[PDB]
Amino acid sequence: QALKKYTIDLTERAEQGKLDPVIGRDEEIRRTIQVLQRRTKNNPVLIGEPGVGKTAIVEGLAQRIINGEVPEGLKGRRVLALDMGALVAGAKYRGEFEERLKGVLNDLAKQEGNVILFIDALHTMVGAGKADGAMDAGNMLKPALARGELHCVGATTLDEYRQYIEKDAALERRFQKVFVAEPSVEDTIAILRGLKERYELHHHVQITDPAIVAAATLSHRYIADRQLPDKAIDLIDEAASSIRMQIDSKLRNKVTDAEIAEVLARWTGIPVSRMMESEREKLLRMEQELHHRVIGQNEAVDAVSNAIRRSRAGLADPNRPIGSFLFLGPTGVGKTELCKALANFMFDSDEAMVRIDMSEFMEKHSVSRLVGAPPGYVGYEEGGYLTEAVRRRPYSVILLDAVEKAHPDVFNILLQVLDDGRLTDGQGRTVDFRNTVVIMTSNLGSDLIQERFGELDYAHMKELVLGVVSHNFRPEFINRIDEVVVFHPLGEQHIASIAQIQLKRLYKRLEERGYEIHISDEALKLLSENGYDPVYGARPLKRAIQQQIENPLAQQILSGELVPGKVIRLEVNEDRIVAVQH
Amino acid sequence: QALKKYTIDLTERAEQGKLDPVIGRDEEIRRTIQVLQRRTKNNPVLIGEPGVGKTAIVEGLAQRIINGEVPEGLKGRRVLALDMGALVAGAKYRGEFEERLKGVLNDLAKQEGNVILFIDALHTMVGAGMDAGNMLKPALARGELHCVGATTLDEYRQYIEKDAALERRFQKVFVAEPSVEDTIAILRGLKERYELHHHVQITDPAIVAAATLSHRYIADRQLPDKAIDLIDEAASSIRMQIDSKLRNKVTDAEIAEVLARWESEREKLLRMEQELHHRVIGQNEAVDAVSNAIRRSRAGLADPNRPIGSFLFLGPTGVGKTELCKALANFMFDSDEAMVRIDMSEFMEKHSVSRLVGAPPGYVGYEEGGYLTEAVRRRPYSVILLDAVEKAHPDVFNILLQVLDDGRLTDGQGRTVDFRNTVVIMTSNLGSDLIQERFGELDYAHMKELVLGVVSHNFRPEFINRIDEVVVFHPLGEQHIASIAQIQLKRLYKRLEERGYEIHISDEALKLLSENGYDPVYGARPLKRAIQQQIENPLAQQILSGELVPGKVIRLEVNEDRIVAVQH
Amino acid sequence: QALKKYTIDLTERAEQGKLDPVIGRDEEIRRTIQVLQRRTKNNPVLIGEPGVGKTAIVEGLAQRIINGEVPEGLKGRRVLALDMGALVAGAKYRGEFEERLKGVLNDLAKQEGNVILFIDALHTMVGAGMDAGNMLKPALARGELHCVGATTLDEYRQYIEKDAALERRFQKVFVAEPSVEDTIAILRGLKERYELHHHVQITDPAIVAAATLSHRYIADRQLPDKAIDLIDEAASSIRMQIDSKLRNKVTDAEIAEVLARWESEREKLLRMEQELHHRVIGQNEAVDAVSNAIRRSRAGLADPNRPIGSFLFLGPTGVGKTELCKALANFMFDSDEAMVRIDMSEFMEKHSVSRLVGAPPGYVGYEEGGYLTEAVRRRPYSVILLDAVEKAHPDVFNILLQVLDDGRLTDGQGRTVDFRNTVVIMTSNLGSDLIQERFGELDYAHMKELVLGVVSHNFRPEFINRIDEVVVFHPLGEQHIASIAQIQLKRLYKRLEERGYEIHISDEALKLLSENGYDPVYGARPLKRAIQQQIENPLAQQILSGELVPGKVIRLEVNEDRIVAVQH
Ligand SMILES: Nc1ncnc2c1ncn2[C@@H]1O[C@H](COP(=O)(O)OP(=O)(O)OP(O)(O)=S)[C@@H](O)[C@H]1O
Ligand SMILES: Nc1ncnc2c1ncn2[C@@H]1O[C@H](COP(=O)(O)OP(=O)(O)OP(O)(O)=S)[C@@H](O)[C@H]1O
Ligand SMILES: Nc1ncnc2c1ncn2[C@@H]1O[C@H](COP(=O)(O)OP(=O)(O)OP(O)(O)=S)[C@@H](O)[C@H]1O
Ligand SMILES: Nc1ncnc2c1ncn2[C@@H]1O[C@H](COP(=O)(O)OP(=O)(O)O)[C@@H](O)[C@H]1O
Ligand SMILES: Nc1ncnc2c1ncn2[C@@H]1O[C@H](COP(=O)(O)OP(=O)(O)O)[C@@H](O)[C@H]1O
C-alpha cells in the first residue's frame, strides 16, 4: 500500500537485528515514551547538537519494542521511519504531493493507533512541499498532530531547530522538546565498550580496552570539531581500518592506544605520541638543540625546555596553556631567534608559526583586529586573525613582539587567554588555546640590564626587572605569566659563534649554488671587529655580514670569477676580505 | 538500465585495460582504501584544485582492482560516476532532481552495495534550489553509499562546512598539484601511449622543457592538465607538419612556439644595463647600480625572507624617476602597468597608517582596504613606488622595517601580503641642491656618500640601514632631455603615422621645442606639456578646417617665435 | 538509410558547389585539424560570437576536405550537418525522436570514424527537451564521437566546462573576428551572388566603404555579418529605387543612406565658441578645453580607441556643467534630450554594481541588464552623464578605468557595449572653496595644479591622469549675468506667448534684476528665483485676477524697487 511506498519499518529491521545495539540514554528514552503515551500532542522531538546519537535513541527504542522491554501499551507497535525524499520526488504536478501525504495520513488513521511515526530531519519536514501555492508538510500534518492522532517522533539539530521550526511557532508548539545532551566521558566509555563487538565482527581484529578509554579521553580533551560519542567512534573505526591495512598489505593484530595517538597525530598533529627513543632522546637534548641555533642566553633555554618537557610528559596543566612566557632583554640578542628555534624544534620550520608584532597595535581598537568585530559591524563574517589562526592549527606557537609599543589595555584579551586558554571571537564561539605557547618580548630595563648584568646574580636582576615590569604592566596580567626570563648582552665569543652559524648556512646555500668555499679565521676576526657593539648586539653583525659578504662575493660570482669545484678561501685584504680561486 | 542513463563504468574499460595507466598518487589511493574499508562513513572526498587527476585516482584504483592490487573487500566492485550537472539542468519543476535521485538510490539498492560511485563538485550537491543532503545524508550514514567525493577546499568550507552533519561523513583527502618531476614521471608513464597513438617519437628533453615552461609562464590550467594539453597539441602540430605535403620527435622549439603564441630571460638579466638604456638616456651609474642589484637579487645569495631590493631615491623629481620605474617594471616582469604610485605626502597621522595598511574591523576603510596592500595583493609581481617619503608619519617606518625585514605584512583584514616579488622604490628630494648645484665635475660615489650622510642626519639610521643602495639621480643636461624630447617627437610621429601623415621638422624648431619647458627645478614633464600644448592644439585646428592631406610632407618650419606647418 | 533521414551532407555540397565560398582562415582550420589529430579531447567546438561565420568555418573545412587541402588521414571523411528540428519535425513520440537519436548514434558507431560530425549550439543539445546532450555524452565517453561544436564562450564556459565529461572531450577553440580586408575578400566572394539575385551591381569602393564604416560605426553587429547586412539591405534599397515608379550600381552613398536611415558641422566646429556662448555664456577656459578635445579627437591626435571626451567638470554650483553638457548635445549631437543621466551618488552601496554595470548569471539584474550598459545598448552614440563622482565605490572607478582603457565594454554578460564615439564627462565640485576664493587674483595654470593636487588627495593618481583634461568652472562677471538674464526673459516671453501674452521690458528693470539677483559666490539660481519672484508673483496676482485682456502690451514698468506690469 502507500505505507510500503514511502515508509521504512525500523522495527522489522531490528526484528532482523540489522540495527545497532544502543546502550544507555535511559531518561531520554523514558521521556520519549512518556510523550508517546499521551492524549494530545504525542510527539517528542530529539533536539540535540549534531552527532550525539539522536537517531540511535529511536533505534534503541525500536529494539526495546522488539525485545518487549516497554510498557504494555507499546507492546507490538511499529516504528516507521518516514521518508521525505520519497514524498517530494514524484510531484511536479499540482496536488500530487498532497495526494501522497493525505493517503499516508489516512493510512495512519487506519492503523488504529498502532504505528509510531519517526521523522528524521524535522527541519526537512518544514520546507517539504514548498511549491508555488502549495502546502508544506506543516499545513497538512498540523491537523492530525494536535488531536493526538499521529505519533510522530522528530529528530533535529538545535541550530536547525532555531532557523527552521522556531521561525514557525505553530508547528513549533506541536512537539515536545527533548534536550539530548552530549554524554560525559565515562558513559561514552561504557557505550564504546558496548560497540566493541560490532567492530570486532567487522574488521576481524581486536581492540585494547585501554585504547578505548584513551580514545574517549583524548577525544574529549583535544578534538574540538565534533561531539561525543561521534568523534571517539570515528577514532576507533579509522584505527581499525589502519590496523587492517597494516596487516593485509605487508606485525600486530590489535588496536593499541599508540595507534589511537597515531590516528590523532595524523589527524591534527598535537603530539600525543608516546616517547619513542628518537623523540625522547630528542627531547632530552632540548637545550643542546636550542644551542644549535642560539648561542648564549642559557636561562630562558632552561625555562622553555622545562615547560615543553612538562607539556610532553603528561604533566600539562589542563586549563592553562603550555607556557605563558615573557622575554626581556636589550635590542638584538636573538629573542626572535629563540622563538624561531622553538618553531624549528617543534615544527621543522621557522615560519610554521604565528608571529603578531604588537608594534602594529599602538592604538587601542586593534583589539578588534585580533579578536574580531561584533554582529552588525563591518568585518563580522571573517573572524579575528588570531582566533582563526589558532582555530586552524591549535598546536602552534603564538608570538607577541615589542610588547611595550601597544596601549596597556590590549591585555585583557590575554587575561582570558592565560587564565583558561579560552578566547571568544566576534561570532561568539570559544577557541581552545590549550595547545599554545605565548611568548612576549620587550626591551624594558635594557639600560638597567646593560648596566648591571655584570657583578649581579641572575635572581636579583630578575627581581629588579620584575619591579620595573610592575611599573609597566598590571598586577593581574603578570600573575598569569608562567615565568619571566631575563636576557643579557653577549660577549664577543657569542657573536663569533653566530658568525660561524652564518658561515654554515652560507656554505649550505652556496653548496646549493654549488661552490666549495672556505674562509680565513682572520676574516672571521675582522667580521667580529666590524659588526660588534654591546648596545645593539648582532644586528650590526647582520648588516656587516650583509654588506661585506653579500656585495663582493655575489659581485664576483656574477663577474664570472667563481668557478664551481674550485677551493675558494675567503682570505683577507689589507682592510677587506678577498676570495681566491684555487 | 537507469545505470545506462547517468553512470559510467570504469571497471568496464579497466577490465579491457582501455584507460590511463595511472602512475603516481599512491598515498591518496591508499587513504581512499582506508576510508572505503571502514564499516561506516565510507564516502571519501578528494580535495584540490581542478585538474589534478582525481578521475585518474579513481581510475587507477579501478586498475588496481582489475590487477588484484587491492585488499579482499574491494573486489567485485563496480566503479560508477554520477553527474551533478544534469540532475539540476534537466530539473524543471518540483521533484525532478529528487525523482532521478530516488530512482538512482533504488536502482543501486538493487545493486546490493557492490558499487563504488564517483561524484565531483561536492559544493554543487549542497545548493541546487532540500535537494540532496537530506536524501544522501541517510545513505551517507547508512553506509550503503560508496561515494567518492571531489571538490576544492574553498567551496568545501564555504558551502559544506556550514552544515556539520554533512561534514561528519565525508573524509578529506588533499590532492595537491603535482610537481614538475612528478609530471615528468607521469608523462614518462604516458609517453608510450602517445607514441603508440600518433606513431611518432617524443623528445624527453622537450618533455622536461615543456613541464618547466608550463610551470613558469602559464598559470591558467595546472599540472598535469597543461602538460598533457601542450604535449598533445604540439604532437598534433608535428603530425600536420609530417602529413602536410621532417621529424617525428616533438621538439622544445615547437613547445616554445605554442607557448608564446597559443627564450629571452637569462641574458636579458645579464644585459640589464642595455635594457635600462633601451628607453632611458643618461643616468649611467644609476643604470649600472640598478642592474647590478637586479643581478644580485637573481644571484640567489640573499635572504629568502627578504625582497628583491631595498631602495631610496633622491634628486630632482620628474626627470625620469617615474620613467625609470616604468622601464624597470617593463624589463623586470612584464610591462608599464605593474606599479602603484603612492604619495607619502598625505600620510602624517595614525589614521594615515589605518588608511594605508588596512582598517581594523568595524571601522571606516575596512573592506575598502589598505591603500598599499590591496594593490599588492592584486599585482603580486610589481614595483612599489613611493613619493616624498620624508613627509611620512614616523610609525609608517615601522611598517617599512617590517617590509624590509620579513618581506610580508599583515593587513588590517588579517592575511599575509608577501613582498618578496616586488621592488621597493622610495623617492625623495631632500638633497636636491646638493646634487643640482654640485653636478659639475663631482663624482657619483662621493656625492652619494655626502647626500648619504645628509639623509643619515635626516632619516632614521636603522631605516637607511636596510636600504641596499641610494642612487643619485644627477640632473640631466640639455642634450639628454633634448634627446628625450626627440623620442617624444618620435612617438608623436608614430601616432600621427597611425593617423597617416608624412611629417618633418626644422632643427631650429627642434631647438625651440627643447627650450620650451626645460627646467632643472621641476622635471621633464614641463617640457612634455609645453611641447604638447604648443603643437597639438593649432594642429587639429588646421586639420579639421580641411587643409591637411594624408601623404603631404609636413615640415615643422619655424616662424619668428613659433612653428608653422607646411603642406608639401 | 537512417542517416539519410534528417542529416545534411556537406562533403557533397562542397563537392557539388552547394556551399558558399569560404576565404582565408588557415590557422583556425589548422588548429581544427590539430584537435582532430589528437589521442584525447579529440572533438573541437567553435567558441564564437553572433555573426562571425562559425558555420562558414565548417563550410571551409568541408571545402578543404573535398579540395584535398587537408592531411591524408582526414581525406574523404564524411562531414554531415546533423539537422536539429528536422529530426524533431517528423517525430511526436517520447521514444521515436529518441529512437531516431539512438539509431543515428548506432550508425555513427557503425561508420567507424569515417564520419566527422558537426553540431552547432551544443548548449541547445544540453537543454533541448533524457535530453539529447546527456544521451550523446556516452558517445563522448566511449571513444566514438567525431563531432564539432559551435557556441558563444558563455555557454561553453557555463553549460560545458562546468560539466566534467563534456569538458574533457573539447578545447577552447576560439573563433576570431576577421579583419576588414578579409571581410572585403569575403564580400568579393559573394558580391556576384547578391548581384545575380537582385539584378543590381555593387561598386568596390562601396564595398571597402561599407566594411570600413561598419568596422567603425557599428560594434554590435559584427564582422563579417554587418557587411552582409549593409550590402544586402542596400541591394534591396536599390531594388526599391528601380521599382519605385535609375541606378543599378550600389554606391557608398547608398551605404550611408542605409546607415543613416537605420551634415555640415566640420567647419562649424571652427565656430565652436559661437554656439557654446549661445547656450553657455562665459567660462572661456572650459570652452577652450572642450574645443581642443573636439579638434584633436576628430582629427585623431591621440588614440582613437578611447571615448572622445573624458572630462571632470570641476567648480562651484550654478555654473551650468549640465548646461554645457546639453550645449554639447546641441552642437555635436543635435539632440539635447539624448544623454545618459546616471548619478554616481547612489553607488556607495556595494550592491549597486548590478544596476550600474550589468550582471553575470547570478543576479536578478541579470534578468533586466545594468541600467548604464542597457542605455548604451539602446543609445551607442550620445553623452553619458555621471554627476557627483565624489560619492562612489572604488570598483565603480575600476569600471571607469575599463571605459578609459577599452573604448568599449565587455559587459556583465560579455556582450557588445561600445564607448569610443560616446563622450563621458563626469561632474563634481570638490575644488569648491579654492575656486570660490582664489579664482580671482590667480592664473589658470597654478589653480589647475592645486586643484589637481586636491583631486589627487581625493582619487587614485593615475585614474585622474586618464582624464582628458582637468577643467575649471568658476564664478562669472557682471555682463554675463545680464546676458543670461536676457536669455531667461526670452524663455519667459516664450512661455507667456504660448499662454497668449506679449511682454515688453524696461532696460531699467533689467538693471533692477541685475542688481537684485546678483552674487557670483553661489551660482545662477539666485538670479532665477529673483526673476521668478519679482516678475511672476505680481503677474500671477494680475492674471488669475482675470484682469489682463490679451493683445495689450505687458510693459514691465518699475517702481522704485519693484516691477509693475500695466495695461494701457
Ligand atoms: N547510546 C548509544 N549506544 C550505542 N551507539 C550509540 C549511542 N549513542 C550514539 N551511538 C552511535 O553514535 C553514532 C552516531 O549517532 P547517530 O544518531 O547515528 O548520529 P545522529 O544522532 O544522527 O547525529 P546527526 O543529527 O545525524 S549529525 C552511531 O554509530 C550510533 O550507533
Ligand atoms: N598519475 C597519473 N597517471 C596518469 N594520468 C594522470 C595522473 N594524474 C593525472 N592524470 C591525468 O591528468 C588529467 C587530469 O584530468 P582530471 O582527472 O579531470 O583532473 P581532476 O583532478 O579530475 O580535476 P577536474 O575538475 O576533473 S578537471 C587526466 O587526463 C588524467 O588522466
Ligand atoms: N553658466 C551658466 N550659464 C547659463 N545658465 C546657467 C549657468 N549656470 C547655471 N545656469 C542655470 O542653472 C540651471 C542648470 O542647472 P545647474 O545644476 O545649476 O547647472 P550647473 O551650472 O552645473 O550648476 P551645478 O554645478 O551643476 S550645481 C539652469 O536653470 C541654467 O539656466
Ligand atoms: N643568540 C643568537 N643566535 C642567533 N642569532 C642572533 C642571536 N642574537 C642575535 N642574533 C641576530 O640578531 C637579531 C636579533 O633578532 P631579534 O630577537 O628580533 O632582536 P631583538 O632582541 O631586538 O628582538 C636576529 O635577527 C639575529 O640575526
Ligand atoms: N569566409 C567566408 N566566406 C563566406 N561566408 C562567410 C565567411 N565567413 C563568414 N561568413 C558568413 O558569416 C555568416 C554567419 O555564420 P554563422 O556562424 O552561422 O552565424 P553566427 O555566427 O551568428 O552563428 C554565415 O552566413 C556566412 O555566410
Technique used by the depositors: cryo-EM
Distances (CA, A) of C475 to A109, A398, C327, C518, C530: 87, 62, 19, 11, 18
Give the other-Cβ count within 10 Å of C196's Cβ: 9
What phi-psi label fits residue C121: left (phi over 0), alpha (psi between -120 and 50 degrees) or beta? left
Q: Report CA(B95)–ligand 1 centroid distance (Å).
A: 30
Whose CA is closest to atom 25 on ligand 3? C317
Strands in C16-83 per DSSP E:
45-48, 80-82
- List the end-to-end C-alpha distance of chain C, in Å, as a whole number: 101
A158/A164 Cα distance (integer angstroms): 10
Omega within 30 of 0 (cis) for the link into B44: no
The residue behind cell 656574477 is A558
Exposed, middle or buried, A514 (CB in 10 Å: 0-12/13-18/19+)?
Answer: exposed
Best probe of the B interface among A19, A20, A83, A88, by most B CBs < 10 A, is: A88
Residues 6+ apart with CB under 8 A from B114: B76, B77, B78
C517/C535 Cα distance (integer angstroms): 12
How many secondary structure helices (H) and strands (E) does chain B include?
26, 15
Tell me the sheet residues that pair with A79: A116
- Candidates C263, C290, C261; CA nearest to C275 is C290
Tell me the sheet residues that pair with C416: C410
**Helices marked H in A16-157:** 26-36, 54-66, 85-88, 96-110, 122-126, 138-145
- Computed on alpha carbons and rounded to an integer, the radius of gyration of chain C in Å comes to 33
- List the end-to-end C-alpha distance of chain B, in Å, as a whole number: 84
Q: Report CA(B65)–ligand 2 centroid distance (Å).
A: 19
Whether the Cβ atoms of residue B352 and residue B396 lie closer than 8 Å to each other: yes
Atom of ligand 1 nearest to the CA of A21: 4
- Candidates C82, C74, C85; CA nearest to C118 is C82
Whether the Cβ atoms of residue C447 and residue C410 lie closer than 8 Å to each other: no
Whether the Cβ atoms of residue A435 and residue A395 lie closer than 8 Å to each other: yes
Beta pairing class for C149-152 and C45-48: parallel
- Answer yes or no: is the C-beta of C182 below 6 A from any ligand 5 atom: no
Give the other-Cβ count within 10 Å of C248's Cβ: 14
Provide the grid cell at B422: 616586488
Angle at B398 (CA atoms; ends B395, B399), nearest 5 degrees: 100
Q: Do chains B and C touch (3 or more CB pairs under 8 A)?
A: yes
B486/B489 Cα distance (integer angstroms): 5
| Pairs across B and C, CB distance < 8 A | 104
- Candidates C45, C25, C6; CA nearest to C147 is C45
C105/C111 Cα distance (integer angstroms): 10
- Computed on alpha carbons and rounded to an integer, the radius of gyration of chain A in Å comes to 34
Q: Chain B residues with CB inside 8 Å of A226's CB?
A: 164, 168
C78/A418 Cα distance (integer angstroms): 78
Give the other-Cβ count within 10 Å of C47's Cβ: 22
Strands in B181-232 per DSSP E:
none
Whose CA is closest to atom 7 on ligand 4? A334
Q: Which of C40, C133, C302 is opposite residue B232, by nearest beta carbon?
A: C40
- Answer yes or no: is the C-beta of C489 below 6 A from any ligand 3 atom: no
Helix (H) or strand (E) holding B339: strand B339-343
φ and ψ of A40, to 5 deg: -110, 135
Proximal ligand: closest to the CA of B148: 2
CB contact under 8 A, B236 and C35: yes
Q: Which residue of C has its CA nearest to B225?
A: C168
Q: Which of C33, C165, C300 is opposite residue B240, by nearest beta carbon?
A: C33
Q: Which residue of B has its CA nearest to A363?
A: B350
Amino acid at A251: L
- Answer yes or no: is the C-beta of B47 below 6 A from any ligand 2 atom: no
A550/A506 Cα distance (integer angstroms): 10
Whether the Cβ atoms of residue A500 and residue A554 lie closer than 8 Å to each other: no
Provide the grid cell at C172: 577552447
Q: Chain B residues with CB inside 8 Å of C164's CB?
A: 55, 83, 85, 120-121
Provide the grid cell at B229: 594539453
Q: Which of B71, B299, B350 is opposite residue A245, by nearest beta carbon?
A: B71
A271/A394 Cα distance (integer angstroms): 12
Residues 6+ apart with CB under 8 A from C132: C101, C125
Largest CA distance in chain A: 110
Residues 6+ apart with CB under 8 A from A409: A364
Whether the Cβ atoms of residue A473 and residue A493 lie closer than 8 Å to each other: no
C300/B497 Cα distance (integer angstroms): 11
Distances (CA, A) of C527 to C433, C519, C560: 21, 9, 19
C504/C563 Cα distance (integer angstroms): 12
A54 annotated to a ligand binding site = yes
Whether the Cβ atoms of residue C187 and residue C61 lie closer than 8 Å to each other: no
Q: What is the 3-state secondary structure (H, E, C) of C164-185?
A: CCCCCCCCCCECCCCCHHHHHH
Q: Chain C residues with CB inside 8 Å of B545's CB?
A: 267, 270
A139/B528 Cα distance (integer angstroms): 78
- Dihedral angle computed from the Cα positions of residues C430, C434, C435 and C440, in that order, rounded to the nearest 10 degrees: 180
DSSP state for residue C112 in the 8-state scheme = T
Residues in chain A: 582
A165/A173 Cα distance (integer angstroms): 9
Q: What percentage of chain A's residues is helix, strand, coil (to nearest 5)? A: 50, 10, 40
C237/C242 Cα distance (integer angstroms): 9
Q: Report CA(C325)–ligand 3 centroid distance (Å).
A: 11
Strands in C272-413 per DSSP E:
310-314, 339-341, 383-386, 408-410
The DSSP-derived string for C505-529 is E-HHHHHHHHHHS--TTT-SHHHHH
- Chains in contact with A via at least 3 Cβ–Cβ pairs below 8 Å: B
The residue behind cell 600620510 is B347
Which residues of B make CB contacts under 8 Å with C? Answer: 5-6, 8, 18, 55, 83, 85-86, 89-90, 120-121, 193-194, 197-198, 228-229, 232-233, 235-237, 239-240, 243-244, 341, 343, 346, 368, 495-496, 499, 536-537, 539-541, 543-546
CA atoms within 13 A on the CB side of B430: 21
Beta pairing class for B503-505 and B554-558: parallel
- Answer yes or no: is the C-beta of A195 below 6 A from any ligand 1 atom: yes
Write the residues followed by a gap in chain A (C–N more than 2.5 A): 250
The DSSP-derived string for A54-79 is HHHHHHHHHHHHHTT-S-GGGTT-EE
Distances (CA, A) of A451 to A488, A531, C188: 10, 21, 96
φ and ψ of A103, to 5 deg: -65, -35
C124/C160 Cα distance (integer angstroms): 11
A262/A41 Cα distance (integer angstroms): 50
Nearest-CA distance C234 → chain B (Å): 30
Residues 6+ apart with CB under 8 A from B340: B372, B375, B376, B379, B382, B384, B385
Amino acid at A226: R
Amino acid at B259: L
CA atoms within 13 A on the CB side of B329: 22
Tell me the sheet residues that pair with C225: none
CB contact under 8 A, C71 and B244: yes
C105/B504 Cα distance (integer angstroms): 69
- Candidates C508, C515, C543, C540; CA nearest to C530 is C515
Q: Report CA(B209)–ligand 5 centroid distance (Å).
A: 40
Amino acid at C140: L
B566/B558 Cα distance (integer angstroms): 10
- Answer yes or no: is the C-beta of C149 below 6 A from any ligand 5 atom: no
Q: Report CA(B212)–ligand 1 centroid distance (Å).
A: 51
A89/A461 Cα distance (integer angstroms): 78
A63/A17 Cα distance (integer angstroms): 8
Q: Which residue of B has its CA nearest to C394?
A: B368
Q: Which of B94, B357, B398 is opposite residue A131, by nearest beta carbon?
A: B94
What angle do helix axes B204-217 and B225-242 make, rounded to 10 degrees? 130
Q: Chain C residues with CB inside 8 Å of B89's CB?
A: 126-127, 159
B292/B275 Cα distance (integer angstroms): 12
Query: Contacts by C522-531 with C-beta closer than 8 Å and gap 24+?
Result: C522/C316, C522/C317, C522/C318, C523/C316, C523/C317, C523/C318, C523/C319, C524/C318, C524/C319, C524/C320, C524/C484, C525/C318, C526/C318, C527/C481, C527/C484, C527/C485, C527/C488, C528/C488, C531/C485, C531/C488, C531/C489, C531/C492
C431/C416 Cα distance (integer angstroms): 36
**Helices marked H in C247-320:** 252-261, 272-279, 284-298
Proximal ligand: closest to the CA of C317: 3
Tell me the sheet residues that pair with B409: B417
SS3 B225: helix
Residues 6+ apart with CB under 8 A from B268: B275, B331
Amino acid at A231: K
Q: Chain C residues with CB inside 8 Å of B233's CB?
A: 31, 34-35, 38
Distance from CA of residue C234 to its chain's centroid?
A: 23
B133/B119 Cα distance (integer angstroms): 13
Helix (H) or strand (E) holding C563: strand C563-566
The DSSP-derived string for A547-569 is IIIITHHHHHHTTT---TTS-EE
B225/B223 Cα distance (integer angstroms): 5
DSSP state for residue C17 in the 8-state scheme = T
| Pairs across A and B, CB distance < 8 A | 154
Q: Which residue of A has its CA nearest to B359?
A: A369
Angle at A39 (CA atoms; ends A34, A44), nearest 5 degrees: 45
Q: Which of B243, B341, B536 is opposite residue C462, by nearest beta carbon?
A: B341
Whether the Cβ atoms of residue A323 and residue A482 lie closer than 8 Å to each other: yes
Residues 6+ apart with CB under 8 A from C415: none
Angle at B226 (CA atoms; ends B221, B230), nearest 5 degrees: 140
Provide the grid cell at C311: 572630462
Query: Contacts by C143-147 with C-beta closer than 8 Å and gap 24+?
Result: C143/B18, C144/C108, C144/C109, C145/C42, C145/C43, C145/C108, C145/C117, C145/C169, C146/C36, C146/C42, C146/C43, C146/C108, C146/C113, C146/C115, C146/C116, C146/C117, C147/C43, C147/C82, C147/C116, C147/C117, C147/C118, C147/C119
Whether the Cβ atoms of residue C59 and residue C17 lie closer than 8 Å to each other: no
What phi-psi label fits residue A517: left (phi over 0), alpha (psi between -120 and 50 degrees) or beta? beta
Whether the Cβ atoms of residue B372 and residue B362 lie closer than 8 Å to each other: no
- Candidates B365, B375, B368; CA nearest to B422 is B375
The alpha carbon dihedral of A231, A234, A238, A239 has a sign of positive
Provide the grid cell at B459: 632619516
Q: Which residues of C are annotated as a binding site?
A: 23, 51-52, 54-55, 281, 318-319, 321-323, 525, 528
Whose CA is closest to atom 27 on ligand 2? B51
Residues in chain C: 568
Q: Chain B residues with CB inside 8 Å of A406's CB?
A: none
A149/B341 Cα distance (integer angstroms): 75
